[PDB]
């Protein structure tokens, strides 16, 4: 079920949607550096191995 480029691009450029994409594609990139902060916290908080 294909739908036309020249149909979609009547709606796809509208202010609410381009704002929505900037919001989500920022929230994702913030979520990812959130994964990184979470992991680095766990790695620092975890007790390191016994010495041989």
């Amino acid at each position: 079920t294909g739908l036309s480029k020249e149909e979609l691009l009547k709606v796809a450029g509208s202010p609410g949607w381009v704002r929505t994409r900037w919001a989500l594609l920022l929230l994702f990139w913030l979520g990812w550096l959130g994964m990184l902060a979470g992991a680095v916290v766990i790695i620092v908080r975890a007790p390191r191995c016994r010495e041989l």
Partner: protein, 454 residues
């Protein structure tokens, strides 16, 4: 608006030497000594997998060149056996094999990348799952924003792989500079010894899923395979030799992580280098599978089996974004599981029977259609040799290890309901079709994506 051709000969060997080298050589050589009994038969088994891979992969230059459509194993299957046989494969690829293959490599990326900070105990399990997901997400983004970036990343990690094995091998010959054993003959062990090697070489079949993006396929695809697969075989048997220059046979039979032992033996002040190289090897293999699998499900959408949203390309960025997001999201589900490994050990056979059915299909296609153009032709003796050896190593090894087939065939037959609902159907439930269209245009407006214009 179509997937723009961007893969060179150079990046075309990076995708294959990229996906092959992986974790296999650094953590599965113990898995051949445990069956072979001896470093003598081990060096043979590691060479025997090489030639068997080369004949297989050159038999894949036939399917590669004769059918440009680049669903790889799935397109070649659809072209011969038709819609339902190909769909059960694509369902298995979608649901189990391709997400779990990415995820366990993401986990293996974590446990080795973190090992320099955890030198003698398990890494914190939650940290390992977070770092696994950070890898799959970062490589999904690096695949969305440029195919030329993604393949430059494949190049970078193909270099990282060959640096790692060069460092192993030169220490091997330095160790030799300072100056075979009793062996089994039982075929019931030899098939298991050899089958344990086919995991390491596995992945030569990957380049075929991206042929439609490769810039001059009738040269570049055949030439990439024969450039790569000999250099894979050489660094593999020389790496497998290098381990026996340093490690006692009894040590390797025990070893949790063979490359870490070799690194700790020689480089003790800075041995953490080798864990980092095996980690970065795995990172590049996640990329290999993301890149390659998103093209499979794109093809599976445009060849009319899968839901339509997965066909839709981003028209400014020229990447099949919903298929990259779909494979990312399917991968991250596996982080929310514990030790599914027994069914994965079953489905490891399913890929080999797909290679068998496809390459059987190559002769079947040769006899039913000698009219076709064939930009290269293969001596029929090589498929005749390869198909029997493949079906032997499937059949005998399966009889020795039918590990979880009760759940295995539970999953395989679960594709047939979805075929009757999604591919066979006469589309009677019009209330659902309004939802299908609505959610489709939602995804198209959200992701900003447009179908393949044939």
């Amino acid at each position: 608006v179509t997937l723009q051709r961007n893969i060179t000969l150079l990046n075309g060997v990076a995708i294959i030497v990229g996906t092959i080298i992986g974790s296999g050589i650094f953590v599965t050589p113990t898995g051949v000594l445990k069956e072979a009994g001896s470093p003598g038969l081990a060096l043979v088994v590691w060479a025997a997998c090489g030639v068997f891979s080369i004949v297989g992969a050159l038999c894949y230059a036939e399917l590669g060149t004769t059918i440009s459509k680049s669903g790889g194993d799935y397109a070649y299957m659809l072209e011969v056996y038709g819609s339902l046989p190909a769909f059960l494969k694509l369902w298995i690829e979608l649901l189990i094999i391709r997400p779990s293959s990415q995820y366990i490599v993401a986990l293996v990326f974590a446990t080795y990348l973190l090992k320099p900070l955890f030198p003698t105990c398990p890494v914190p399990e939650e940290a390992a799952k977070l770092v696994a997901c950070l890898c799959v997400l970062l490589l999904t983004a690096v695949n969305c924003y440029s195919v030329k970036a993604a393949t430059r990343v494949q190049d970078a990690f193909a270099a990282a792989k060959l640096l790692a094995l060069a460092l192993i091998i030169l220490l091997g010959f330095v160790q030799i500079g300072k100056g075979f054993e009793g062996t089994k003959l039982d075929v019931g062990n030899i098939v298991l010894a050899l089958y344990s090697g086919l995991f390491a070489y596995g992945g030569w079949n990957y380049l075929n899923f991206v042929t439609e993006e490769m810039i001059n396929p009738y040269r570049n695809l055949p030439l990439a395979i024969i450039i790569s697969l000999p250099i894979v075989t050489l660094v593999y048997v020389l790496t497998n030799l290098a381990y026996f220059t340093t490690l006692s046979t009894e040590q390797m039979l025990s070893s949790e992580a063979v490359a870490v032992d070799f690194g700790n033996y020689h480089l003790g002040v800075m041995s953490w280098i080798i864990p980092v190289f095996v980690g970065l090897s795995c990172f590049g293999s996640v990329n290999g599978s993301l890149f390659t699998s998103s093209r499979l499900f794109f093809v599976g959408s445009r060849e009319g089996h899968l839901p339509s949203i997965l066909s839709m390309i981003h028209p400014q960025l020229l990447t099949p974004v919903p298929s990259l997001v779909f494979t990312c999201v399917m991968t991250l589900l596996y982080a929310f599981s514990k030790d599914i490994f027994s069914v994965i050990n079953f489905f490891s056979f399913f890929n080999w029977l797909c290679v068998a059915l496809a390459i059987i299909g190559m002769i079947w296609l040769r006899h039913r259609k000698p009219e076709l153009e064939r930009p290269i032709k293969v001596n029929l003796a090589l498929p005749v040799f390869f198909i029997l050896a493949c079906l032997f190593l499937i059949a005998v090894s399966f009889w020795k290890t039918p590990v979880e087939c009760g759940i295995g065939f539970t999953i395989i037959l679960s594709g047939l309901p979805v075929y009757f609902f999604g591919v066979w159907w006469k589309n009677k439930p019009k209330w659902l079709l309004q939802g299908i269209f609505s959610t489709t245009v939602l995804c198209q407006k959200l992701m900003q994506v447009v179908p393949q214009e044939t």
